[PDB]
Amino acid sequence: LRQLNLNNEWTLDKLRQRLTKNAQDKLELHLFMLSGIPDTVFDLVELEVLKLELIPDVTIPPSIAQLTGLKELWLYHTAAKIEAPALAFLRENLRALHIKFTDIKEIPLWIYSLKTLEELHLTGNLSAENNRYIVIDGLRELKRLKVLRLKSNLSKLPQVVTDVGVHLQKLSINNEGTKLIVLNSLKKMVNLTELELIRCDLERIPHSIFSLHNLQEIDLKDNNLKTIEEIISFQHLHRLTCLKLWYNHIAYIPIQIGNLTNLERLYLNRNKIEKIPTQLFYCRKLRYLDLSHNNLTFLPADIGLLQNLQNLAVTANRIEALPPELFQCRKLRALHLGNNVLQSLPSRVGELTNLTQIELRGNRLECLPVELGECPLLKRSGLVVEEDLFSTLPPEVKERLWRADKE
Amino acid sequence: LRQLNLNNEWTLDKLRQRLTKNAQDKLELHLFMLSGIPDTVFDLVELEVLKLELIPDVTIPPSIAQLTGLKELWLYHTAAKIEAPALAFLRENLRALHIKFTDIKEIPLWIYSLKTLEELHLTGNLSAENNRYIVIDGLRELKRLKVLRLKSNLSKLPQVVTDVGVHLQKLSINNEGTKLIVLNSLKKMVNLTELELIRCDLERIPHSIFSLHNLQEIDLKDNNLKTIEEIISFQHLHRLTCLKLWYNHIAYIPIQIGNLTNLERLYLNRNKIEKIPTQLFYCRKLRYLDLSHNNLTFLPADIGLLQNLQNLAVTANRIEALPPELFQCRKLRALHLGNNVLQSLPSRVGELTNLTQIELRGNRLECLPVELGECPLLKRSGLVVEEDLFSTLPPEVKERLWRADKE
């Protein structure tokens, strides 16, 4: 009766109100704390992302076949039991699938029978007792799976994952405070294009990566390296396009990474950098950099060799002026100089019209120039300049900046 | 009472607004999980695609004669019982019967009296115990079966299909990861115009494809292939005009790919290709060169030889620069060039008058050339480029471009 009441209670009109848009401009429905699943939810064909969160006693009716745009279904803490015609429909229609659970209790069985899906995101503790990678032994039949994010506090790499990966393309590893035992088993699996390692507390980058020549995006965030004698061994790999080593504790970055001109992204913010020598910056074509919250006394000169920048950061450190070497660069769009001690502002940095988003709030500048008055490109919603001296700025400068907040 | 209630819930005026249009611009009526098939549906006189999906145990009444435009009878999972005058109506009238199914009772036992059938796709697994293809042993009775699309997961090509093959022309065998062991059974089949071994896990192209002399449209999608060395034997086929090679694992191409001058729509996309030979441009009839999402480091210049080329799509490659003689082609209709690592577009793109959609979202374009506004047929909607990169155009030039957009 409650399920029948839910259908009449949730009208299509009320549901259309609940539809929002996600990052991909796709229509998402957030079903939050519903005792059942309304058939009116499957009535509305405009849905794309079906977020059903902590919904118990789920029996997904095949009226979902009438829903047209469904490529995402977000199963959070749900014991799902789908019907066979719905199985047939989602085998040809669904394209991504996120699953959150508490061990075997909320892991569903119909997920394996769907063999055409691309994205299979698994959330919840899979490191359960007495079930050491034996539940996921039924993943072998999946040959179309290319994106597989594994965030389940895994202890070891499953051998079944090694068997299945032959047709994989994207893989992400999140351990949230657990030392993974990789044991160099990645030599088998060659097709992999994107690999990520977040907060593994390793300090020792494995060797099986170098046998793979297809990795373009490598994310090693919060790995806390201190002496990277690995970027002399990363010279073996000639596919990595953007290294992501941010929120580490790098004491000094070893110079050899200067030889990879294909590097385009230097994420190194919130670090313990004391001095970083020059030859790091022999690569010219780096766009995004982040160096916030450091102890650097001067930004090294051969960053001046970098001519293809888009973002930097001098946040919360002991740098008082922008060197002429940084003025040899011509592509400073974004920066992060807020809550800092920058004193002198020359005309070279100020004439950079394409300044996209520079943090400057809390900076210890002396006075702000009248060069923030006229042009319709560099303005407040772009550049958040220090508001203590924005008051002493002329009202026409404030006109440009408030124009940013309007235009 | 059931039919009266059914008609009351879904009256002719109710389904009049429900009248929708399909891809073929024929009127369609998606009847889904409805208790019976209504007579108010039949009161229409121009429905061409009767979409009968999951309607359990219903007798089609004589009122179906009102559907004068009914060419395609889409029977999906529907237990359909029908009377003798309408069986005769089927043997003399119906030209297309598009069947999705799961059971040999869902497929009806009165379509083998049907004779005027000219189009049909079967969708649904057919591998069953003691009841294989005795269902469609009336294919021999079906003397006009030219279109036979099979998303039916057949483990082997039926021999009754071969005996039909005197008039069979299109065989889209989407086996969903099952190999079609042709075993030169298509050697007997000397009259085909098309063959599509889609997702059939070949890894080796059979000789039954080459042995013919009437094939025109060959589509080998997702076969995990490595080498295409066998096209020297393709010179026997004098009518091949298209090879859509979608989603394969090809490491490299040989040079003899240039031999097939008869090729028009040569697809080589979603591959691991690192080198395209100059010999490849020996072909002169190439019309649809879709090289989307590839590993091509640069567009070769000799591609200017293709004077019939209309839709050249090279999105998401690693293409650095565009050579000049690339722009010798003027018949280009859809240049999808996005997600590249291109630094700039040469001014010869302003020479393009047929420029309708050029995808520049990405690349490294400092400023758009003004000549992009010169293209008359190009409107602002067709100019797929980032707004920040787009905004460099002059004010009255933007006024003319917006005038073209609103016209």
PDB file of N, CA and C in Angstrom, chain A residues 172-227:
ATOM      1  N   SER A 172      41.250   3.844 -11.275  1.00  0.00           N
ATOM      2  CA  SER A 172      41.597   4.740 -10.180  1.00  0.00           C
ATOM      3  C   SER A 172      41.681   3.941  -8.888  1.00  0.00           C
ATOM      4  N   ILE A 173      42.713   4.207  -8.091  1.00  0.00           N
ATOM      5  CA  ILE A 173      42.960   3.486  -6.847  1.00  0.00           C
ATOM      6  C   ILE A 173      42.964   4.489  -5.703  1.00  0.00           C
ATOM      7  N   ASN A 174      42.004   4.347  -4.791  1.00  0.00           N
ATOM      8  CA  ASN A 174      41.921   5.158  -3.579  1.00  0.00           C
ATOM      9  C   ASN A 174      41.874   4.208  -2.388  1.00  0.00           C
ATOM     10  N   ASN A 175      42.805   4.377  -1.451  1.00  0.00           N
ATOM     11  CA  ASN A 175      42.918   3.490  -0.301  1.00  0.00           C
ATOM     12  C   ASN A 175      42.572   4.165   1.019  1.00  0.00           C
ATOM     13  N   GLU A 176      42.393   5.493   1.020  1.00  0.00           N
ATOM     14  CA  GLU A 176      42.090   6.347   2.173  1.00  0.00           C
ATOM     15  C   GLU A 176      42.800   5.923   3.458  1.00  0.00           C
ATOM     16  N   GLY A 177      44.125   5.831   3.411  1.00  0.00           N
ATOM     17  CA  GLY A 177      44.903   5.529   4.598  1.00  0.00           C
ATOM     18  C   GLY A 177      45.239   4.062   4.776  1.00  0.00           C
ATOM     19  N   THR A 178      45.609   3.388   3.689  1.00  0.00           N
ATOM     20  CA  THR A 178      45.989   1.982   3.740  1.00  0.00           C
ATOM     21  C   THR A 178      47.102   1.733   2.734  1.00  0.00           C
ATOM     22  N   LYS A 179      48.153   1.044   3.171  1.00  0.00           N
ATOM     23  CA  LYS A 179      49.285   0.735   2.301  1.00  0.00           C
ATOM     24  C   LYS A 179      48.932  -0.442   1.401  1.00  0.00           C
ATOM     25  N   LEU A 180      48.748  -0.169   0.111  1.00  0.00           N
ATOM     26  CA  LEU A 180      48.414  -1.213  -0.852  1.00  0.00           C
ATOM     27  C   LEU A 180      49.620  -2.110  -1.102  1.00  0.00           C
ATOM     28  N   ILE A 181      49.367  -3.408  -1.261  1.00  0.00           N
ATOM     29  CA  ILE A 181      50.405  -4.357  -1.645  1.00  0.00           C
ATOM     30  C   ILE A 181      50.251  -4.673  -3.129  1.00  0.00           C
ATOM     31  N   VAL A 182      50.911  -3.885  -3.980  1.00  0.00           N
ATOM     32  CA  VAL A 182      50.783  -4.074  -5.423  1.00  0.00           C
ATOM     33  C   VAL A 182      51.559  -5.308  -5.871  1.00  0.00           C
ATOM     34  N   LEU A 183      52.796  -5.450  -5.385  1.00  0.00           N
ATOM     35  CA  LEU A 183      53.656  -6.610  -5.647  1.00  0.00           C
ATOM     36  C   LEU A 183      53.951  -6.785  -7.136  1.00  0.00           C
ATOM     37  N   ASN A 184      53.964  -5.662  -7.866  1.00  0.00           N
ATOM     38  CA  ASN A 184      54.455  -5.596  -9.248  1.00  0.00           C
ATOM     39  C   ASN A 184      53.723  -6.567 -10.176  1.00  0.00           C
ATOM     40  N   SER A 185      52.392  -6.542 -10.126  1.00  0.00           N
ATOM     41  CA  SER A 185      51.580  -7.401 -10.977  1.00  0.00           C
ATOM     42  C   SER A 185      50.949  -6.665 -12.152  1.00  0.00           C
ATOM     43  N   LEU A 186      51.426  -5.460 -12.481  1.00  0.00           N
ATOM     44  CA  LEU A 186      50.829  -4.693 -13.570  1.00  0.00           C
ATOM     45  C   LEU A 186      51.498  -4.952 -14.914  1.00  0.00           C
ATOM     46  N   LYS A 187      52.501  -5.834 -14.967  1.00  0.00           N
ATOM     47  CA  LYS A 187      53.199  -6.090 -16.225  1.00  0.00           C
ATOM     48  C   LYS A 187      52.298  -6.770 -17.249  1.00  0.00           C
ATOM     49  N   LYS A 188      51.282  -7.502 -16.787  1.00  0.00           N
ATOM     50  CA  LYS A 188      50.379  -8.199 -17.699  1.00  0.00           C
ATOM     51  C   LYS A 188      49.544  -7.230 -18.526  1.00  0.00           C
ATOM     52  N   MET A 189      49.097  -6.134 -17.915  1.00  0.00           N
ATOM     53  CA  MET A 189      47.908  -5.436 -18.396  1.00  0.00           C
ATOM     54  C   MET A 189      48.380  -4.135 -19.060  1.00  0.00           C
ATOM     55  N   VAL A 190      48.297  -4.125 -20.396  1.00  0.00           N
ATOM     56  CA  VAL A 190      49.080  -3.177 -21.191  1.00  0.00           C
ATOM     57  C   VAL A 190      48.209  -2.048 -21.737  1.00  0.00           C
ATOM     58  N   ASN A 191      46.891  -2.252 -21.785  1.00  0.00           N
ATOM     59  CA  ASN A 191      46.025  -1.335 -22.526  1.00  0.00           C
ATOM     60  C   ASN A 191      45.698  -0.073 -21.726  1.00  0.00           C
ATOM     61  N   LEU A 192      46.248   0.064 -20.522  1.00  0.00           N
ATOM     62  CA  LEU A 192      45.735   1.043 -19.570  1.00  0.00           C
ATOM     63  C   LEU A 192      46.211   2.448 -19.919  1.00  0.00           C
ATOM     64  N   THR A 193      45.262   3.382 -19.979  1.00  0.00           N
ATOM     65  CA  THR A 193      45.542   4.750 -20.386  1.00  0.00           C
ATOM     66  C   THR A 193      45.646   5.728 -19.225  1.00  0.00           C
ATOM     67  N   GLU A 194      44.844   5.562 -18.172  1.00  0.00           N
ATOM     68  CA  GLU A 194      44.846   6.481 -17.040  1.00  0.00           C
ATOM     69  C   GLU A 194      44.922   5.690 -15.742  1.00  0.00           C
ATOM     70  N   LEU A 195      45.924   5.994 -14.919  1.00  0.00           N
ATOM     71  CA  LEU A 195      46.121   5.347 -13.626  1.00  0.00           C
ATOM     72  C   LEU A 195      46.291   6.425 -12.562  1.00  0.00           C
ATOM     73  N   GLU A 196      45.679   6.213 -11.397  1.00  0.00           N
ATOM     74  CA  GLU A 196      45.691   7.186 -10.309  1.00  0.00           C
ATOM     75  C   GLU A 196      46.026   6.480  -9.003  1.00  0.00           C
ATOM     76  N   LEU A 197      46.760   7.172  -8.131  1.00  0.00           N
ATOM     77  CA  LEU A 197      47.129   6.673  -6.807  1.00  0.00           C
ATOM     78  C   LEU A 197      47.004   7.840  -5.831  1.00  0.00           C
ATOM     79  N   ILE A 198      46.006   7.788  -4.954  1.00  0.00           N
ATOM     80  CA  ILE A 198      45.707   8.897  -4.055  1.00  0.00           C
ATOM     81  C   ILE A 198      45.893   8.455  -2.611  1.00  0.00           C
ATOM     82  N   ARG A 199      46.802   9.133  -1.904  1.00  0.00           N
ATOM     83  CA  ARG A 199      47.036   8.957  -0.467  1.00  0.00           C
ATOM     84  C   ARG A 199      47.303   7.496  -0.111  1.00  0.00           C
ATOM     85  N   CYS A 200      48.338   6.931  -0.727  1.00  0.00           N
ATOM     86  CA  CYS A 200      48.731   5.561  -0.442  1.00  0.00           C
ATOM     87  C   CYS A 200      49.834   5.467   0.603  1.00  0.00           C
ATOM     88  N   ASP A 201      50.473   6.590   0.942  1.00  0.00           N
ATOM     89  CA  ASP A 201      51.556   6.653   1.928  1.00  0.00           C
ATOM     90  C   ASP A 201      52.686   5.689   1.574  1.00  0.00           C
ATOM     91  N   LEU A 202      52.984   5.602   0.277  1.00  0.00           N
ATOM     92  CA  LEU A 202      53.976   4.642  -0.192  1.00  0.00           C
ATOM     93  C   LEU A 202      55.395   5.158   0.010  1.00  0.00           C
ATOM     94  N   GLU A 203      55.688   6.352  -0.521  1.00  0.00           N
ATOM     95  CA  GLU A 203      57.017   6.958  -0.639  1.00  0.00           C
ATOM     96  C   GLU A 203      57.896   6.203  -1.644  1.00  0.00           C
ATOM     97  N   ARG A 204      57.419   5.068  -2.161  1.00  0.00           N
ATOM     98  CA  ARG A 204      58.217   4.227  -3.049  1.00  0.00           C
ATOM     99  C   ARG A 204      57.341   3.888  -4.257  1.00  0.00           C
ATOM    100  N   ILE A 205      57.598   4.562  -5.372  1.00  0.00           N
ATOM    101  CA  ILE A 205      56.771   4.393  -6.573  1.00  0.00           C
ATOM    102  C   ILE A 205      57.126   3.073  -7.251  1.00  0.00           C
ATOM    103  N   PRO A 206      56.150   2.229  -7.591  1.00  0.00           N
ATOM    104  CA  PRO A 206      56.467   0.871  -8.050  1.00  0.00           C
ATOM    105  C   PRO A 206      57.106   0.840  -9.431  1.00  0.00           C
ATOM    106  N   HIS A 207      57.597  -0.348  -9.792  1.00  0.00           N
ATOM    107  CA  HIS A 207      58.363  -0.549 -11.016  1.00  0.00           C
ATOM    108  C   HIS A 207      57.531  -1.083 -12.177  1.00  0.00           C
ATOM    109  N   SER A 208      56.336  -1.618 -11.914  1.00  0.00           N
ATOM    110  CA  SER A 208      55.553  -2.235 -12.980  1.00  0.00           C
ATOM    111  C   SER A 208      54.941  -1.198 -13.914  1.00  0.00           C
ATOM    112  N   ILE A 209      55.007   0.081 -13.543  1.00  0.00           N
ATOM    113  CA  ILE A 209      54.462   1.139 -14.389  1.00  0.00           C
ATOM    114  C   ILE A 209      55.276   1.281 -15.669  1.00  0.00           C
ATOM    115  N   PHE A 210      56.594   1.085 -15.584  1.00  0.00           N
ATOM    116  CA  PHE A 210      57.483   1.365 -16.707  1.00  0.00           C
ATOM    117  C   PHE A 210      57.322   0.381 -17.858  1.00  0.00           C
ATOM    118  N   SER A 211      56.830  -0.829 -17.600  1.00  0.00           N
ATOM    119  CA  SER A 211      56.515  -1.775 -18.663  1.00  0.00           C
ATOM    120  C   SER A 211      55.287  -1.358 -19.461  1.00  0.00           C
ATOM    121  N   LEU A 212      54.515  -0.407 -18.944  1.00  0.00           N
ATOM    122  CA  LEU A 212      53.349   0.099 -19.653  1.00  0.00           C
ATOM    123  C   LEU A 212      53.692   1.410 -20.348  1.00  0.00           C
ATOM    124  N   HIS A 213      53.345   1.505 -21.631  1.00  0.00           N
ATOM    125  CA  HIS A 213      53.696   2.659 -22.452  1.00  0.00           C
ATOM    126  C   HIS A 213      52.465   3.425 -22.926  1.00  0.00           C
ATOM    127  N   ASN A 214      51.370   3.377 -22.167  1.00  0.00           N
ATOM    128  CA  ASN A 214      50.125   4.010 -22.578  1.00  0.00           C
ATOM    129  C   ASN A 214      49.533   4.942 -21.529  1.00  0.00           C
ATOM    130  N   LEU A 215      50.241   5.203 -20.433  1.00  0.00           N
ATOM    131  CA  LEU A 215      49.702   6.047 -19.371  1.00  0.00           C
ATOM    132  C   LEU A 215      49.931   7.520 -19.682  1.00  0.00           C
ATOM    133  N   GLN A 216      48.836   8.264 -19.854  1.00  0.00           N
ATOM    134  CA  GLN A 216      48.895   9.690 -20.135  1.00  0.00           C
ATOM    135  C   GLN A 216      48.694  10.564 -18.907  1.00  0.00           C
ATOM    136  N   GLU A 217      47.793  10.189 -18.002  1.00  0.00           N
ATOM    137  CA  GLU A 217      47.508  10.962 -16.799  1.00  0.00           C
ATOM    138  C   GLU A 217      47.835  10.113 -15.579  1.00  0.00           C
ATOM    139  N   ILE A 218      48.829  10.545 -14.807  1.00  0.00           N
ATOM    140  CA  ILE A 218      49.235   9.866 -13.582  1.00  0.00           C
ATOM    141  C   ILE A 218      49.005  10.835 -12.432  1.00  0.00           C
ATOM    142  N   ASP A 219      48.223  10.408 -11.443  1.00  0.00           N
ATOM    143  CA  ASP A 219      47.910  11.219 -10.271  1.00  0.00           C
ATOM    144  C   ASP A 219      48.531  10.548  -9.052  1.00  0.00           C
ATOM    145  N   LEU A 220      49.477  11.239  -8.421  1.00  0.00           N
ATOM    146  CA  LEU A 220      50.147  10.766  -7.216  1.00  0.00           C
ATOM    147  C   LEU A 220      49.973  11.763  -6.075  1.00  0.00           C
ATOM    148  N   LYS A 221      48.743  12.242  -5.892  1.00  0.00           N
ATOM    149  CA  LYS A 221      48.460  13.254  -4.885  1.00  0.00           C
ATOM    150  C   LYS A 221      48.669  12.701  -3.479  1.00  0.00           C
ATOM    151  N   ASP A 222      49.295  13.518  -2.626  1.00  0.00           N
ATOM    152  CA  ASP A 222      49.481  13.221  -1.202  1.00  0.00           C
ATOM    153  C   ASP A 222      50.290  11.943  -0.991  1.00  0.00           C
ATOM    154  N   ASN A 223      51.255  11.700  -1.875  1.00  0.00           N
ATOM    155  CA  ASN A 223      52.160  10.568  -1.733  1.00  0.00           C
ATOM    156  C   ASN A 223      53.396  10.903  -0.910  1.00  0.00           C
ATOM    157  N   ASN A 224      53.607  12.186  -0.600  1.00  0.00           N
ATOM    158  CA  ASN A 224      54.629  12.640   0.349  1.00  0.00           C
ATOM    159  C   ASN A 224      56.039  12.231  -0.070  1.00  0.00           C
ATOM    160  N   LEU A 225      56.383  12.452  -1.336  1.00  0.00           N
ATOM    161  CA  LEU A 225      57.752  12.219  -1.778  1.00  0.00           C
ATOM    162  C   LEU A 225      58.676  13.283  -1.199  1.00  0.00           C
ATOM    163  N   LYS A 226      59.951  12.933  -1.039  1.00  0.00           N
ATOM    164  CA  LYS A 226      60.949  13.857  -0.512  1.00  0.00           C
ATOM    165  C   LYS A 226      62.174  13.974  -1.407  1.00  0.00           C
ATOM    166  N   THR A 227      62.591  12.884  -2.043  1.00  0.00           N
ATOM    167  CA  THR A 227      63.640  12.896  -3.062  1.00  0.00           C
ATOM    168  C   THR A 227      63.142  12.035  -4.218  1.00  0.00           C
TER     169      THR A 227
END
